[PDB]
Amino acid sequence: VPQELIEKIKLISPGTELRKALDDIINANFGALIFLVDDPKKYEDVIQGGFWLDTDFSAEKLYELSKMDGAIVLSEDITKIYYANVHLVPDPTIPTGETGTRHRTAERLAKQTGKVVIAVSRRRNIISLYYKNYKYVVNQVDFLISKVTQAISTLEKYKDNFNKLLSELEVLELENRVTLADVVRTLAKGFELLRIVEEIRPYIVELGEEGRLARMQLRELTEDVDDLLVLLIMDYSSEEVEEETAQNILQDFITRREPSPISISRVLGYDVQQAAQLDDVLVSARGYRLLKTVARIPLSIGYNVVRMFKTLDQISKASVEDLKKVEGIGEKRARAISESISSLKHRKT
Amino acid sequence: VPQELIEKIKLISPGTELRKALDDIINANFGALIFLVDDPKKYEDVIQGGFWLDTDFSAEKLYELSKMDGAIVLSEDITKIYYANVHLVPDPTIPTGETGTRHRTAERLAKQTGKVVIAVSRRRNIISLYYKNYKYVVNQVDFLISKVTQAISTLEKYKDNFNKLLSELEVLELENRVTLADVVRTLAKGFELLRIVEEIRPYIVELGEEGRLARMQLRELTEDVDDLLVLLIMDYSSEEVEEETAQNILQDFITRREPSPISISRVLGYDVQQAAQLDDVLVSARGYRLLKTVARIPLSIGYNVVRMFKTLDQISKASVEDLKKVEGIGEKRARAISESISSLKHRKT
Ligand SMILES: Nc1ncnc2c1ncn2[C@@H]1O[C@@H]2COP(=O)(O)O[C@H]3[C@@H](O)[C@H](n4cnc5c(N)ncnc54)O[C@@H]3COP(=O)(O)O[C@H]2[C@H]1O
DSSP B317-335: H--HHHHHTSTT--HHHHH
- Give yes or no: residues B162 and B132 share one domain: no
Atom number, ligand 1, closest to the C-alpha of residue B101: 39
Distances (CA, A) of A230 to A186, A316, B46: 12, 22, 71
The three-state secondary structure class of B47 is strand
Asked if residue B161 and residue B130 are part of one domain, the reply reads no
Distance CA(A138)–CA(A121), nearest Å, equals 13
Report the distance separating Cα B69 and Cα B67, nearest Å. 7
Instruction: Mark whether A172 and A261 lie in a shared domain.
Output: yes
What is the Cα–Cα distance from B128 to B334, expressed in whole angstroms?
Answer: 62
Tell me the C-alpha distance between B313 and A110, whole Å: 97
Q: Which residues of A touch B55 (CB under 8 A)?
A: 51-52
Cα B225–Cα B186–Cα B228 angle in degrees, nearest 5: 25
Which of B58, B65, B67 would you mutate first to test chain A, the one with the most A CBs within 10 A? Answer: B67
d(Cα B99, Cα B97) in Å, to the nearest integer? Answer: 7
> Does A29 touch chain B if contact means CB atoms closer than 8 Å?
no
Q: Is B85 on the interface with A (CB under 8 A)?
A: yes
Residue where one domain finishes, among candidates B104, B138, B172: B138
Please state, in angstroms and rounded to a whole number, the distance separating the CA atoms of residues B96 and A67: 32
CA A65 – CA A40 distance, rounded (Å): 18
Query: Taking the C-alpha atoms of B35, B41, B47 and B52 in order, what is their torsion angle to the nearest 10 degrees?
Result: 80
Nearest by CB to residue B51, choosing from A53, A67, A69, is A53
Query: Are A53 and B53 an interchain contact pair (Cβ–Cβ within 8 Å)?
Result: yes
- CA-closest candidate to residue A315, choices A231, A237, A333: A333
Q: What is the DSSP string of A229-279?
A: HHHHHHHHSSS---HHHHHHHHHHHHTTS---HHHHHHHTT---S-GGGGG
Return d(Cα A44, Cα A301) in angstroms, integer. 66
Shared domain check, B228 and B108: no
Instruction: Indicate left, alpha or beta for A145 from its phi (over 0: left) and psi (-120 to 50: alpha).
Output: alpha
Indicate if B158 and B249 belong to the same structural domain: yes
CA distance B349 to A211: 107
Q: How distant is the Cα of A67 from the closest Cα of chain B, in angstroms?
A: 6
A138 sits in which H/E element: strand A135-138
Report helix, strand or coil for B242: coil
Residues A56, A159 within the same domain: no
Q: How far is the CA of A24 from the centre of ligand 1 (A)?
A: 20
Residue B224, exposed/middle/buried by CB under 10 A (0-12, 13-18, 19+)?
Answer: exposed
Got the DSSP string for B94-142? S-----SHHHHHHHHHHHHHS-EEEEE-SS---EEEEETTEEEEEPPHH
Q: Are residues B101 and B146 in the same domain?
A: no
Same domain, A340 and A307: yes
Q: What is the CATH number of the domain that holds A43?
A: 3.40.1700.10
Which residue puts its alpha carbon closest to atom 4 of ligand 1? B101
Question: Are residues A242 and A187 part of one domain?
Answer: yes
Q: Which of A41, A12, A338, A1 is nearest to A206 (CA)?
A: A12
B65 to chain A nearest CA, in Å?
Answer: 7
Q: Which of A235, A257, A286 is the last residue of a domain?
A: A286
Q: HSE (CB half, 13 Å, CA atoms) of B327? A: 6
Query: Same domain for B52 and B3?
Result: yes
Interacting residues of B55 by C-beta distance below 8 A, sequence separation 6+ = A51, A52, B61, B80, B81
The Cα diameter of chain A in Å comes to: 88
Give the count of beta carbons closer than 10 Å to the beta carbon of residue A221: 17
CA–centroid distance, residue B69 to ligand 1 (Å): 9
Task: Say yes or no for a CB contact (<8 Å) between A64 and B65.
Answer: no
Q: How many domains does chain A have?
A: 3
Residue of A58, A73, A85 to mutate, testing the B interface (most B Cβ within 10 Å of its Cβ): A85
Say whether A286 sits in a helix, a strand or coil: coil
**Alpha carbon distance A108, A115 (integer Å):** 11
Rounded to whole angstroms, what are the CA distances from A223 to A158, A226, A239?
14, 8, 28
Q: How far apart are CA A348 and CA B7, in angstroms?
A: 101
Q: For residue A84, how far is its CA from the centre of ligand 1 (angstroms)?
A: 24
CA-wise closest residue to A151 among A208, A106, A110, A207: A207
Ligand 1 pocket, mutate which of B35, B43, B101 (most atoms under 8 A from CB): B101
- Domain enclosing residue A318, as ranges: 287-349
**Residue A57 touches chain B, beta carbons under 8 Å:** no
Tell me, in angstroms, the distance from the centre of ligand 1 to residue A215's CA.
Answer: 43
Residue A217 sits in a domain whose CATH number is: 1.20.1260.110
| DSSP-derived secondary structure letter, A192 | H
Residues B196 and B147: their CA atoms lie apart, in Å, by 12
Examine the domain organization and report whether A244 and A324 are in the same domain. Answer: no
Give the integer Cα–Cα distance in Å for A2 and A5. 5
- B111 pocket-lining for ligand 1 (C-beta < 6 Å): no
Q: Beta A116-120 vs A51-56: how paired, if at all?
A: unpaired
Nearest CA residue ID for atom 38, ligand 1: B101
For residue A331, give the CATH number of its domain: 1.10.150.20
Q: Is the Cβ atom of B73 under 6 angstroms away from ligand 1?
A: no
Same domain flag for B302 and B226: no
Q: What is residue A129's three-state secondary structure?
A: strand
Domain boundary pick from A286, A312, A338: A286
